[model samples]
Target: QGRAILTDRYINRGTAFTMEERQKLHILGRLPPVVETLEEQVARVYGQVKKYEKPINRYQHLVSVHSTNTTLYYATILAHLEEMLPIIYTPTVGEACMEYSHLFFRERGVYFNRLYKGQFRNIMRDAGYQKVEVVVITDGSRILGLGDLGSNGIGISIGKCSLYVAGAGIDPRLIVPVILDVGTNNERYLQDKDYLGMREKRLGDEEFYELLDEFMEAASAEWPNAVIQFEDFSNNHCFDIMERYQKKYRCFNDDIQGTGAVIAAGFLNAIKLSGVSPLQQRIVVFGAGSAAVGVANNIAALAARMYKFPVQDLVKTFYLVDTKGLVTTTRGDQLAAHKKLLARTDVSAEDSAKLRTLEEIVRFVKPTTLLGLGGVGPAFTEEIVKMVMQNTERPIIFPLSNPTSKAEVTPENAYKWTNGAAIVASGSPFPPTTIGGKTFKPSQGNNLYVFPGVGLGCALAQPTHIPEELLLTASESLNLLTTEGDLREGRLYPPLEDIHNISANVATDVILEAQRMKIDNNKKLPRTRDELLAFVKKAMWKPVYSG
Candidate 1:
């Protein structure tokens, strides 16, 4: 019952099986006749992906696996998750969602439209979930890079939960992928005749909230104790929806919290490039979006909880800059709730230019570190980058945006602009860029570094509530994995080749925190970091039965 539904090798292209082979397998007449070696077929599929120019094309190439070759799809994702995840969910997934109406694919996931509202509970009951524990829900409002996708965003839930099982030890049987098709406002989608979603402008805030409220309520009724991880709600809704139910319901937003944890973990390691303590150092964040706010909030929260600093006191260490310029005490009335919370009331008097441009902020703040999540590529200009280097011995620069194309600054730019003095990392993967005759490996501050392990902890503890304490634990665990050598080399993240152990370490930290908070009802809590690490490591089941 716990085994994969399919195996490696499609064995057939169109027809299900050869007559004789099917007969031997007890279904001679039930299936058709087409047989091929799975290796060649899987290779062919990967070849198509390798040649695909557009992200949507690559996505289509991958999804074809679910129908004609389910086993290979699973195998490919399992084997190349680090590469495929970004292809499946981010930069690529966003493009796919945008083009979804034009290039409709085979249908998957449960679609609960307004018609299914009253009957949704019955539909779920009929589906018969015996032990569903993880529910990833999205309305498609804010798909990565591509923005709103309406119903087509189901691919995200499916793709993300797949990682939950492959990376974490979660049982596939105990997972559910949900998409709420509220409708879309993308005019291009609305005008397209082939649109797959409800073709209308997106619902108003109040209406959208009600729809989500019902979905959350109906979903919780079925799996009373399940952990819901909200995905892809727009900046406007991401925090509100999360805050409204987070305390009352067992859930968290990956964009709002998980993104922060992973970036903060990397920053913690990067900070070691210099001797300054976290509290004493000044930071300027180059964005005020959900992701930027998440990072600032998590770091400040960590300082407060781990070191007993007041929340407000910790907030002062971070300065935020957006299109409006630096977030200062004067902007309190105009700032978004999350943005305002990340600002310090004690900062220098608000200067309009510093608030609007990276250069002005760098000149004014002279921060020891600079972080960019502004979705504005190359936003860190030459002078702004040099300012970071001139002000600090080893200036920490994290140009963390996404899609390789969207990074605020590339590793090469960071090194070149700062004359190799800037310790660099990014939201996208980059090959080591040499500066001053030294090879510098730029770490990918991917949320993959934290979310999979966080998901694992939620699945392991089956907790009714996962607090900031656990995330703090994860951040510490992630930072701990980086050795002194990695630090000396200007790299802060553990090698991606060893990510499974890193995930296990983070999960172990989560489990320990769970037990400490008295939320670990599993009675399976391990005693020490070593014990917990071993437990999680032991739980991850690799594909051995399939050859």
Candidate 2:
């Protein structure tokens, strides 16, 4: 084997080499006498991973192993994805970011800071990847609920890239994880000597925007066909950048668009269970930031499509609550542009001021479902949930927050508070909640369900631009993949074990829509759903080794 093949994670098989192949590669004497199948290697790796008692230890081991033997690392994860995803991505990943400077081991992805002012494009060009297809980039401004993490947020990018490969079968070689460290505003990070990022306050708008503009230009020049994902950016920049560059580049914000689609799918299932038409349900959203606004927007659009109405007409049904209280027209210029659609305008000034607390808003709105996107700690109080239960026969409560600590409410609380009438979903995973001698599984409203499929479809279809309709396409596709049996078990989504299949289904629908819109430049398009599925299956990267 050539040296390139030996080092390439996509091609490397490690100790699974055959006797003849080992001799040909001049490694017969270097390796042990025993040779094993890929299955055996996976089992051995699994055993090693299970030996670690804590999740971070396992995360460290998995990351370390990945740097050494990439193929085996993915093979291990692919075999046990349901058990490992949380460790690699959401809850554990947030912890890793918290201790990142202390747990520093190896540099994983490219980092851009203020020092690269004039040379942003050159740096991207010099990185030497010739054909990048997907880029997950973050500015480290607002990472989960932990706030600005500076370059430590690179872990978020890496974790997301891993999911794109494991969940949607994207080629590892075609993806890039990037962190733009203008600096951080967090006092603790700025004070810590161990911090691995620029130790100054974040750049002002002028400098920050210039750096961002340069980077996007450089990235597009480097890989014209790549789909850029904006992750963990603050509320202002997330909305601003996505709106600005989406038409110019093949890019989408995961926190806004990706999370929007996944949450929309979960609510679709929730509405189905409640026996309510999309037009009749009133949604009360907690945390009117980028994520919450996105969720409300996407859900409204989905309902609009179903009922054949304008999105504006459907948006009026949502009531958004931020830190201040319910978002109302009385807030006037103080409200952000994205929240305008869902902001309540009919309320009189006195009534608006009265709806200050979440309980007051819930009591007055009488929503059929309560959605939480703000990562504030345990926002769904017992009183709030009980109130929801009183208003609706089957209350749909989605406290979608990451890093278990930041979740608005636990599944146990939802089940108990509502007398088993609450249909619960969260951003982080939770154990099955038992009530009245029945075990119920709570669906997690995780973005993993949508982004991977969207990324894969972007790579395959080469869509010129990703429209909101594409996200709706993915949401509807995911909703259809959830079986009746899964719904009976109270799952709003398919099991994580079936994520690859679900992603494939979602990808197929996205590709079909892209073809219909004639935005996909790929000349060879599948004519039927079966053909598209087969094409997706054939294009995916498998964990098994090839000589």
Whose lDDT is greatest here? 2
lDDT of 2 by residue, 226-317 (tens): 89999888865877897789888899988888878888888988988888666677888888776678778888777666557777778877
Q: Local error of candidate 1 at 314, Å? A: 3.4
Candidate 2 wrong stretches, greater than 4 Å = 1-8, 94-98, 101-108, 145-147, 186-199, 307-313, 328-336, 345-354
**Global lDDT scores for all candidate models:** 0.72, 0.82
TM-score of 1: 0.85
| Residue 65, model 2: Cα distance from true site in angstroms | 1.7
lDDT of 1 at 502: 75
| Clashing residue pairs in candidate 1 (N, C-alpha, C atoms within 3 angstroms) | 325-355, 325-356, 326-355
- Local accuracy of candidate 1 as per-residue lDDT tens digits, 160-236: 77667656656666778888888887777788777777877777888777777777777778876568898888867
Give each model a TM-score: 0.85, 0.91
- Model 1: lDDT of residue 55: 70
